Amino acid sequence: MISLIAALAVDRVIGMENAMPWNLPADLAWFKRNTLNKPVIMGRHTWESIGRPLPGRKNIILSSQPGTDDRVTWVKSVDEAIAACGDVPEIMVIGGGRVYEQFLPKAQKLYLTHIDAEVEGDTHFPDYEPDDWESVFSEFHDADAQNSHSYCFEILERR
Ligand SMILES: NC(=O)c1ccc[n+]([C@@H]2O[C@H](COP(=O)([O-])OP(=O)(O)OC[C@H]3O[C@@H](n4cnc5c(N)ncnc54)[C@H](OP(=O)(O)O)[C@@H]3O)[C@@H](O)[C@H]2O)c1
Ligand SMILES: Nc1nc(=O)c2nc(CNc3ccc(C(=O)N[C@@H](CCC(=O)O)C(=O)O)cc3)cnc2[nH]1
Ligand SMILES: [Mn+2]
Ligand SMILES: [Mn+2]
Ligand SMILES: [Mn+2]
């Protein structure tokens, strides 16, 4: 099973200048809980944005060019990325925009954080078709002293 996990600001913005400009510790904790002990697939730009391997997860990087770091696994196509995960129950695709576009048709589940923040960005999550997806979990949180925007954790499953 392939799942996508992402945090979206207004208008599906996910990034600007290879960074995420907001800071929502509660959402990063949600990301860690939902990805730990699973393989994570990311594009090369997202690997550069994170800047280090994510511990406790098999890190698989898509790039058309040879890898430059043997602490992670490098692959050259979507099918190779999936194969490199082996026989696991759930593969987590962690972006960025180009990678989400390619894996969305293959995904059965979306873990989305909707952040009430207006961000100029240069990268968006794919337009997906709402009729294809059932919301099975949602949890809203107001802003607090640690999280400066309100946010909604949602899990959607392909109908
Ligand atoms: N809010 C969030 O949830 C979230 C999550 C992830 C990322 N982001 C943000 O998203 C932005 C990065 O997204 P992006 O769309 O620019 O880049 P990306 O999807 O992270 O990376 C694209 C790169 O991945 C490689 N790639 C993708 N598909 C491939 C394929 N089928 N075969 C081989 N290589 C492939 C290529 O690398 P080569 O050029 O080396 O061939 C391509 O240039 C950043 O702003 C980051 O902060 C946000
Ligand atoms: N909901 C969501 N939020 C995100 O921030 C997110 N980020 C990415 C890609 N970028 C990043 C950037 C940093 C870390 C990171 O530092 N993660 C630590 C945080 C642990 C914690 O804060 O409790 C990790 O071990 O996962 C992960 C992904 C992909 N999907 C996402 N999905
Ligand atoms: Mn092929
Ligand atoms: Mn197999
Ligand atoms: Mn806000």
UniProtKB/Swiss-Prot annotation:
Show the Gene3D superfamilies listed in the entry. Answer: Dihydrofolate Reductase, subunit A
* Additional remarks: The strain K12 sequence is shown. Strain B [RT500] is resistant to 500 micrograms per milliliter of trimethoprim.
Its biological purpose = Key enzyme in folate metabolism. Catalyzes an essential reaction for de novo glycine and purine synthesis, and for DNA precursor synthesis.
Q: What is the effect of changing M16N?
A: Increases catalytic rate about 2-fold. Increases catalytic rate about 7-fold
Q: In which pathway does it act?
A: Cofactor biosynthesis; tetrahydrofolate biosynthesis; 5,6,7,8-tetrahydrofolate from 7,8-dihydrofolate: step 1/1
Q: Per the database record, which ranges form the DHFR domain? A: 1-158
* Any single Pfam family the record assigns to this protein: DHFR_1
| Keywords associated with the record | Antibiotic resistance, Methotrexate resistance, NADP, One-carbon metabolism, Oxidoreductase, Trimethoprim resistance
Reaction(s) catalysed by this chain, per the record, are: (6S)-5,6,7,8-tetrahydrofolate + NADP(+) = 7,8-dihydrofolate + NADPH + H(+)
Q: Which GO terms describe its molecular function?
A: dihydrofolate reductase activity; dihydrofolic acid binding; folic acid binding; methotrexate binding; NADP binding; NADP+ binding; NADPH binding
Question: Record's Gene Ontology CC terms?
Answer: cytosol
Quick one: effect of changing M42Y? Increases catalytic rate almost 2-fold. Increases catalytic rate about 7-fold
- Gene assigned in the entry: folA
What residues bind substrate, as annotated?
A: I5, D27, R52, R57, T113
Give GO BP annotations, semicolon-separated: 10-formyltetrahydrofolate biosynthetic process; dihydrofolate metabolic process; folic acid biosynthetic process; folic acid metabolic process; one-carbon metabolic process; response to antibiotic; response to methotrexate; response to xenobiotic stimulus
Q: Under what name is this protein listed?
A: Dihydrofolate reductase
**Magnesium in keyword set:** no
Instruction: Give the family, as the similarity comment puts it.
Output: Belongs to the dihydrofolate reductase family.
